Amino acid sequence: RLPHWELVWSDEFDYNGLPDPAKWDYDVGGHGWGNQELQYYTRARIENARVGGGVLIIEARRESYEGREYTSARLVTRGKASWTYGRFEIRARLPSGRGTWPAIWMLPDRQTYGSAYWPDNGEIDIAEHVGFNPDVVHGTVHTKAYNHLLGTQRGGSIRVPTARTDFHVYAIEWTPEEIRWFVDDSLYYRFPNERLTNPEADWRHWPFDQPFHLIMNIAVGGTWGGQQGVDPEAFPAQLVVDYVRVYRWVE
Numbered sequence: 340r341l342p343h344w345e346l347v348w349s350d351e352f353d354y355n356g357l358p359d360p361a362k363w364d365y366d367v368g369g370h371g372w373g374n375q376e377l378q379y380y381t382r383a384r385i386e387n388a389r390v391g392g393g394v395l396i397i398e399a400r401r402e403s404y405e406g407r408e409y410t411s412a413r414l415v416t417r418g419k420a421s422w423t424y425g426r427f428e429i430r431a432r433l434p435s436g437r438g439t440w441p442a443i444w445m446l447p448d449r450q451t452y453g454s455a456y457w458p459d460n461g462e463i464d465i466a467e468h469v470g471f472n473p474d475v476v477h478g479t480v481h482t483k484a485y486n487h488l489l490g491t492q493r494g495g496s497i498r499v500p501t502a503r504t505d506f507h508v509y510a511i512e513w514t515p516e517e518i519r520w521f522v523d524d525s526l527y528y529r530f531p532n533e534r535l536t537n538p539e540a541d542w543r544h545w546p547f548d549q550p551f552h553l554i555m556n557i558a559v560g561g562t563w564g565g566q567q568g569v570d571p572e573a574f575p576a577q578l579v580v581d582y583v584r585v586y587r588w589v590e
């Protein structure tokens with residue numbers, strides 16, 4: 340073989356209707372999602388997750404729903420597809436609006452490393468954006484030693500002037516040695532596997548040698564998305580996804 344990124348999973352959203360149930364499941368609930376978020380993430384609701392016109396729209400809606408004043412979708416490949424290492428691309432246009440918090444990210448299939456699921460086993464934030472600070476995209480990792488609870492999370496950012504007007508390929512290349520974040524293949528952050536350079540480094544610093552699945556949502560408000568409040572006029576807000584593509588590196 341020639342060394343190259345091999346496509347192993349993708350959704351080009353070339354169909355019509357609900358997110359393909361073979362590739363996508365939903366996170367459902369309005370319990371705050373650990374962030375005091377205001378939305379109810381709905382299941383297979385076309386208002387919140389619809390495919391058409393060559394794209395997926397994850398849509399945040401201001402509406403009275405199951406005790407919540409907003410609905411949204413948190414689309415996951417959990418239980419459908421997960422990967423250990425790879426190049427992960429999500430071509431998306433980000434939603435606008437103070438109170439919006441679109442995320443493209445990953446969580447571990449399993450609690451391999453004790454004694455909690457999170458952050459012990461990690462979280463790879465491929466692209467995070469908050470409406471009250473438009474155009475700035477964050478790539479971030481959370482691990483037992485590096486997480487937002489300890490204030491020790493590791494990530495970078497990059498201003499994407501046309502994030503909310505145009506599509507941008509948000510990508511990580513996650514390998515045994517490091518995670519690299521790209522916007523349109525602008526490398527704006529990388530997270531080295533400290534286990535390979537530091538004998539005292541373990542899963543607490545690099546848990547990313549286990550299968551992660553992809554998540555895509557728009558949170559409404561909560562700790563980060565809504566510390567400037569939630570602009571109700573910012574709705575409906577759309578996270579529009581041209582495609583999700585996952586590659587594995589083959590040598």
Ligand SMILES: [Ca+2]
Binds near residue numbers: 352353
């Ligand atoms: Ca597409």
